[PDB]
């Protein structure tokens, strides 16, 4: 406890930090899914080809 | 409590913070819907073309 959080508060912070990261990642995944439908990236070596 | 508030104010401020955030977002959603009607973004790879 070099910072000042108790063991329980460390457990509490970690639990909601994990799900906040998960929700943020999940929203980003759908955003990338939608962005891919609008305009895909990673073209073939010959180009996008329309 | 490094903030200086008890647990009573925490849920009080949070509840008001969330509902204010909802009002701000819903208004922004309506603004973007009107903005899309006036001038849509996200063109096709071939352009807008009206």
């Amino acid at each position: 406890s070099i910072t000042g959080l108790t063991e329980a508060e460390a457990k509490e912070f970690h639990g909601i930090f994990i799900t906040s990261f998960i929700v943020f990642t999940v929203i980003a995944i759908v955003a990338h899914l939608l962005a891919w439908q609008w305009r895909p990236w990673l073209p073939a070596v010959t180009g996008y080809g329309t | 409590s490094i903030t200086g508030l008890t647990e009573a104010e925490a849920k009080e401020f949070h509840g008001i913070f969330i509902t204010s955030f909802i009002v701000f977002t819903v208004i922004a959603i309506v603004a973007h819907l009107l903005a899309w009607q006036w001038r849509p973004w996200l063109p096709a790879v071939t352009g807008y073309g009206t």
Binding site: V30, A35, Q37 | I18, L33, W41
Partner: peptide, 22 residues
Amino acid sequence: MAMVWMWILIAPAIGIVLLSRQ
């Protein structure tokens, strides 16, 4: 494609509320 912006705006908003009611 109104849905492309629809998620990136609305979902983080509904994400905070659903996250804050666990």
